[PDB]
């Protein structure tokens, strides 16, 4: 489990959390190209069940 | 048919009687079924339900 560690320490019941967006701003967005995907599915309304509609 | 014996049968003729029986039908034995487009991405349950209905 520790092989997957990504942070140098844990939380200790008093660690103050600082918010980073303290002011409005239109976000610029960067990523790796294989980070966002779009799953898609068909809607099988061509079945013989849906008669009367094309 | 009835019958009678003898040579002279004056004013002893008989009519014809043909009775009949009546046949009808009952109410249909329906089988309703309701589905959506999602549940037709496999169609195995649909086919099995149709066969079981028959």
Between chain A and chain B, the number of residue pairs with CB atoms below 8 A apart is 14
Residues of chain B with C-beta less than 8 angstroms from the C-beta of A42: 41
For residue B25 the two structure tokens come to 């039908």
Tell me how far CA of residue B45 lies from CA of A43, A49, B37, B40, in angstroms: 17, 13, 13, 9
Q: Which of residues 15-54 of A touch B (CB under 8 A)?
A: 41-45, 47, 49-50
Angle at the Cα of B47 (from B42 to B53), degrees rounded to 5?
145
Across the interface, whether the CB atoms of B37 and A41 are under 8 A apart is answered no
> Reported resolution in A?
3.2
Q: Is the separation of the CB atoms in B39 and B51 below 8 Å? A: no
The experimental method behind these coordinates is cryo-EM
d(CA B30, CA B46): 17
Q: Print burial letters for B8-47: b (CB count within 10 Å at least 16), e (below 16).
A: eeeeeeeeeeeeeeeeeeeeeeeeeeeeeeeebeeeeebe
């Amino acid at each position: 489990q520790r092989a997957y560690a990504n942070v140098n320490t844990s939380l200790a019941d008093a660690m103050a959390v600082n918010i980073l967006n303290v002011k409005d701003a239109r976000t610029n967005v960067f990523w790796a190209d294989d980070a966002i995907r779009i799953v898609s599915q068909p809607i099988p309304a061509n079945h013989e069940l849906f008669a009367g509609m094309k | 048919s009835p019958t009678q014996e003898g040579w002279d049968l004056t004013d002893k003729a008989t009519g014809l009687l043909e009775l009949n029986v009546a046949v009808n039908m009952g109410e249909p034995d329906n089988d309703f079924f309701q589905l959506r487009a999602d549940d037709l991405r496999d169609e195995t349950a649909y086919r099995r339900r149709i066969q079981s209905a028959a």
